[PDB]
Structure 1
Amino acid sequence: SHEDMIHDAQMDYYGIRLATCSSDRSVKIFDVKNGGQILIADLRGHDGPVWQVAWAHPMYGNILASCSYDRKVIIWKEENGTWEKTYEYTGHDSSVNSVCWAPHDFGLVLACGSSDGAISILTFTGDGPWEVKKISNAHTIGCNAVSWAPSVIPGSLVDQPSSQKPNYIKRFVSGGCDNLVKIWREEDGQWKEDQKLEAHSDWVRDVAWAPSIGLPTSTIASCSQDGRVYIWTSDDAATNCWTPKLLHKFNDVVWHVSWSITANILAVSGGDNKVTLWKESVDGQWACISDVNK
């Protein structure tokens, strides 16, 4: 159905379940067979408009997370095709925004990004309780988006294509509205100052890390509120060198920037009703091949 506006709509890893989180106060999951659709799940337990969503791998546990405009984090687990209650958190400085799990190379650590002034990381260990990591005094105005970064990318450490197993530690980036971008790395058993940078004096929307499956180059494409875009590239060992370069700037309100599942195509969605689908060519440059209407 979905009569109101639809936010995000993700699909299962096999192509059967479709989780569409909208503001219609109803989350309906249908089926994919013979080109048709049949309603199979109807979940509802939020207090406001549901925003982002993120899936997980069944080998580590069928767990879904949903964020809404109510400062409440909702988590469900799948058993026998039915999703029930798991972990329900409530109470923050502002409403939760971004939500995503770490890649399968690390585990099932969830990231909570919101304009609350602090960072609350949820870690799923064992088969029951969880752990909370609180980082304060890291954002003056607050966070905005959190994009995970796997360790299987050869662009970060030049030692992967040599029969050497790299470290499996947590690493990601953050670009809140505190006029500062930052990198977070799980070192010294906790979290502290790793690498900060100043490239704006307002708000920054989201970021997208390149999940390269065979490309030894780690890139991050950002998007701000005033159509600002930054392409941070790295291809060194141990320590990386993020270059705050520019590409195709905008003047409207650029919203989302999403990389393909294998770091092949970039999709940028803002206020131009056009999703420029870029792609790396054989000449080491960028080229747009296909578009779409919004």
Structure 2
Amino acid sequence: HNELIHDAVLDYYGKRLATCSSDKTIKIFEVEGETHKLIDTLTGHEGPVWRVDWAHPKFGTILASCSYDGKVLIWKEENGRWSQIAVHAVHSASVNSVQWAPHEYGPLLLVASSDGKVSVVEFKENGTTSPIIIDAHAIGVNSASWAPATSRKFVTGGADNLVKIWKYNSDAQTYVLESTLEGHSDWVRDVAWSPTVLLRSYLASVSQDRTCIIWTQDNEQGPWKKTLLKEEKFPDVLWRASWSLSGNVLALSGGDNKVTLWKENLEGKWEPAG
């Protein structure tokens, strides 16, 4: 019995899968082609676990999950026995996304909850949490993705149909908003920064209004460029939108039971692939 899992994540080396469902449990699997043997079940949430996310193995085996009970729970495998080492629930509503930073930033976490907040939880020398939070969106935040870089930044998708690009500032010590972008007529479900250290940067912003805008910024200066992936509404509301590391391929999880795939061509415009 597992009729509705909400999120799954793969570890750096892809040996250990972590699915999370609505019955509150987080199941860990040892994958091997066909056969994923169930190795664990983790019960510590008071509502459907929306998302899970491993951290960089540089920090051992850590997995931050966020669930409907408004609480972010950090887990850790310890000699082959899992244990909830920390928790971070400074958010008064259902926590939606949770995504670790690039491992060069430390062990930073990115939480994004419906109380219009988004936190960056550092884990200090005592391993204790060092929360520095910001207000992100009015009617709630559905998602928040990190950006790689070599001047740190992330993106957030809102319930006011916004897509925001925040940047760290030593003057403020809190991430200062640097640019907001408007293009959807309904709750911005997911936002994704692309890991392509190439000539430009790409953002795929899926939404409830069955659109997927692509914000391609030329460089560090010239603002983004709006590009409705295709100019027809998808047969059903879209949920997830993920970039590929090698290649800059885009995967779109529409509520139409297939996942589409879109690649950029020399027109600059985007074309299906599969």
The normalised TM-score by structure 2 is 0.88
Matches within 5 A, 1:168-187: 169-187=151-169
* Alignment equivalent of 1:246, drawn from 198, 211, 228: 228
Counterpart secondary structure, 2:225:
coil
Q: Which has the larger radius of gyration?
A: 1
SS at match of 1:101: coil
Check 1:32–1:280 CA distance in 2 against 1; reply closer, same or farther (3 A cut): same
Alpha-carbon offset, residue 10 of structure 1: 2.0
2:217 to 234, 237, 244: 234
| 1:138-153 alignment, distance < 5 Å | 138-151=136-149
CA distance in 2, matches of 1:234, 1:34: 38
Deviation of 1:81 after TM superposition, in Å, equals 2.3
Distance 2:223 2:90 in 1: 37
Which letter does structure 1 place at the counterpart of 2:214? I
Structure 1 unaligned regions, length at least 5: 152-165
Query: Does 2:113 correspond to 1:114?
Result: yes
Q: Quick check: 2:96–2:141 contact (8 Å CA) kept in 1?
A: no
Specify whether residues 8 and 140 from structure 1 end up closer, same or farther in structure 2 by C-alpha distance, changes over 3 A only. Answer: closer
SS of 1:59's partner is helix
- Match for residue 156 of structure 1? none
Contact kept, 8 Å, 2:77 with 2:83, in 1: the verdict is: yes
Distance change in 2, residues 1:61/1:139 (3 Å): same
* Contact residue 60 and residue 107 of structure 1 kept, 8 A: no
The alignment status of 1:85 with 2:69, answered yes or no, reads: no
Alignment partners' CA distance in 2, 1:143 and 1:108: 22
CA shift digits 1:135-181 (9 cap, x unpaired): 24x42212221011010xxxxxxxxxxxxxx4xx4201112112433
Cα distance in 2 for partners of 1:198, 1:264 equals: 23
Which amino acid in 2 is paired with 1:246? L
The C-alpha deviation readout for 1:46-100, integer Å capped at 9, x for no partner, is 1111111111121133210111111111111222222212112336332000110
Equivalent pairs, count: 270
Q: Which amino acid aligns with 1:217?
A: R
> What is the rounded CA distance, in whole Å, between the counterparts of 2:2 and 2:157 in structure 1?
33
Asked if residue 286 in structure 1 is aligned to residue 267 in structure 2, the reply is: no
Write the deviation string for residues 197-236 of structure 1: whole angstroms up to 9, x where unpaired.
Answer: 33345421111111115x3221001011111221100232
Tell me what 1:260 maps to. 244
Kindly indicate whether the alpha-carbon contact (under 8 Å) linking 1:4 and 1:23 is maintained by their aligned counterparts in 2. no
Specify every segment of 5 or more residues in structure 2 that has no aligned partner in the other structure, as ranges: none
Q: Distance in 1 between matches of 2:199 and 2:158?
A: 28
> What is the alpha-carbon distance in structure 1 between the residues aligned to residue 145 and residue 247 of structure 2?
14
The alignment status of 1:73 with 2:72, answered yes or no, reads yes
For 2:33 and 2:165, the matched residues in 1 are separated by 45
SS in 1 for 2:65: strand
Is the Cα–Cα contact under 8 Å of residues 230 and 246 in structure 1 kept in the other structure? yes
Say which structure is richer in strand: 2
State the TM-score, normalized to the length of structure 1: 0.83
Q: Which residue of 2 aligns with 1:208?
A: 192
Q: Which residue of 2 aligns with 1:98?
A: 97
